[PDB]
Design a protein around this ligand. Sequence first.
Ligand SMILES: C=C(C)[C@H]1CC[N@@H+]2CCC[C@H](C)[C@@]2(C)C1
Ligand SMILES: C=C(C)[C@H]1CC[N@@H+]2CCC[C@H](C)[C@@]2(C)C1
Ligand SMILES: [Mg+2]
Ligand SMILES: [Mg+2]
Ligand SMILES: [Mg+2]
Ligand SMILES: [Mg+2]
Ligand SMILES: [Mg+2]
Ligand SMILES: [Mg+2]
Lengths: 304, 304
Amino acid sequence: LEPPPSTFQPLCHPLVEEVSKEVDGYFLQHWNFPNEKARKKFVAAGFSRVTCLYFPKALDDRIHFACRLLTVLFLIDDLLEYMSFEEGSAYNEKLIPISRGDVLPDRSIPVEYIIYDLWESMRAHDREMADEILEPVFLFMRAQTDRTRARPMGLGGYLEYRERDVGKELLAALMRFSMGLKLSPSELQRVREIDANCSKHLSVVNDIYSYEKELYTSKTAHSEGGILCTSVQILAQEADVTAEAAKRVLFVMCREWELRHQLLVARLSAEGLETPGLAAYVEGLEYQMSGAELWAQTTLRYSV
Amino acid sequence: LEPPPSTFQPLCHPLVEEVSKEVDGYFLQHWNFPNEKARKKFVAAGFSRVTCLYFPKALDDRIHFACRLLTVLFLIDDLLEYMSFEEGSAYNEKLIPISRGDVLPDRSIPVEYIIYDLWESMRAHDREMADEILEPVFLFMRAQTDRTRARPMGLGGYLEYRERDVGKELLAALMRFSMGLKLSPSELQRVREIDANCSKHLSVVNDIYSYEKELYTSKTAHSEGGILCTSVQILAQEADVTAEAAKRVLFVMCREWELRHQLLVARLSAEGLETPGLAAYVEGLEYQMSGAELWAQTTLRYSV
Ligand SMILES: C=C(C)[C@H]1CC[N@@H+]2CCC[C@H](C)[C@@]2(C)C1
Ligand SMILES: C=C(C)[C@H]1CC[N@@H+]2CCC[C@H](C)[C@@]2(C)C1
Ligand SMILES: [Mg+2]
Ligand SMILES: [Mg+2]
Ligand SMILES: [Mg+2]
Ligand SMILES: [Mg+2]
Ligand SMILES: [Mg+2]
Ligand SMILES: [Mg+2]
């Protein structure tokens, strides 16, 4: 599968080696892997490597929080494949008060106390921005078990939904957190179009490289939790072509959203609307788009 | 614009120039054109030229019949853009019993006696093969003013509907009629999948090249009869990109259908399933696709 040209240049955080070994070790110490094989697979996926690709301009003392959050959010995304919607919702909902720091963790259950301890250290470092990540996270978590996954969706319907299930807002607030990027409500409203456009790129690039994994998941895991929900499948059905054909067509569209991103950014500069904070923000969203693509191409998580 | 490569080579019927003067000459004589600017525009469209690219291996004494049918269907296609869905339906339904020979034409209304004399002459040359073109035509006629045009559609449902509105079935029967190509029912049953795939290519390729023309029509003619119903519109909506962007993506989807055409034709031959009659037919379809594209990218009908 050959990717079409992109003008984007992915960047990686300079401390990716240290921070990855640090956060990897942590999870190998506290998390519950079924066997040595699953432990090996976990390190292979490179969950801190991708976090360092999403947020290459992260503050050095802050990047490790993001790796931690995204790692466990990744570990859970996989576990939900083997539950029903009910089971999966119950699972997520228990973690939400713990995340607010409202209910203590059952310290026998790794996921409970890992999440509790994460959010506490985050609020300790920067309470205000830490707190602005909470609702975007929950929004994502409740999307993961939304019954709309079991209803037929067209392309537009799907992207509307995937904006939550792919975690666009949570990634945005985590980005802002990890950089210390403070934006007024004015500025944040000002770029809703750029967000929406960027969300489609993140969704579809991921749909393209993870399709094979997800096809096998839809055959072997839970009939609800492992349900096949992807633009690849939708487009394949609608255009009556193979998934491989659909991938190639969706990749060209992703490049159109990149171009559209440059256009919107340029236009926002063509008024005084591009504040310095906003400028660093939309540069940030470009790192996410390109970074996620670089990782998706090279991670063992998707070529297996 | 910049079409990506195609494996298909177009062919033009050798008599294209004679039949063009002849058929153009007939319609310039009988059709009620409003003025001289429109008679010139009709000749610049080159309708006999596109017919001779659709069916480049049509029998020499049969190709003119096809130029006639398509020429009158092109003219009526433009008419219905000035009509409501009701007016257009009323107009086409008049013509349906006249085509069958069940009703005599009003010899003072050109469209009626042109239609009547066309079908009677075609039944004279090959009764049973002419017969089989009728219902596919009425099917495309009725599609043209179906209110589903004005309702929301996703890409999939659009292609389903456009299979009728692009007249894929009438084109098939016509191609057979033009070539003396008789196929058994079970033969036709074997290429149904190949037919459907070919439909999408014809539709979307036409949609790409005729978009600026249809845009303008939607804005100037009747709000119903000239409504913008096109894959370029639908993809641009679902994916939130410009029309030019959608065209670039749809073009890639069209090459994927050429690939699928080839794959389906190879599969058919690898069983003992490609009869000699079927062999001509699917080669026939491939001329329709590459021919439609050649005309579309040069006709003044879509460029001015
Ligand atoms: C940014 C992406 C393409 C998503 C890849 C998959 N993971 C699942 C775990 C949580 C993340 C937000 C994400 C949805 C990111
Ligand atoms: C085969 C096509 C892409 C269509 C081009 C436009 N014309 C309009 C008049 C009727 C024809 C069947 C057609 C729809 C063919
Ligand atoms: Mg998921
Ligand atoms: Mg998943
Ligand atoms: Mg995926
Ligand atoms: Mg039409
Ligand atoms: Mg038309
Ligand atoms: Mg058109």
